[PDB]
Amino acid sequence: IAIPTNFTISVTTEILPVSMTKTSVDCTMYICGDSTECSNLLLQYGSFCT
């Protein structure tokens, strides 16, 4: 058998992500900017932005 006659105390680092960046997108402003008729066309696609 082999038995230890001494010890070492080791500190080791573990790294874990917990969060992302909370991002939001204004669907209408992304797709159509400030064009009224582009927005009207976008209404034809329903609830995709929602």
């Binding site: 204004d26 209408t28 402003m29 900017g33 400030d34």
Partner: protein, 50 residues
């Protein structure tokens, strides 16, 4: 240089042909509004976060 654009290629600033001043263009549609409500069941009051 007559006008400037952002990463998306959106025109962000222009030069007035006559005065030759630089004007930034910002969308006239604020879509960063949130409404805090305790519920229509309990009250009709609200708060607004811009």
């Amino acid at each position: 240089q007559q006008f400037g654009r952002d990463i998306a290629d959106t025109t962000d600033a222009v030069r007035d042909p006559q005065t030759l001043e630089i004007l930034d263009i910002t969308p006239c549609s604020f879509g960063g509004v949130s409404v805090i409500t305790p519920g229509t069941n309990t009250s009709n009051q609200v708060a607004v976060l811009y």
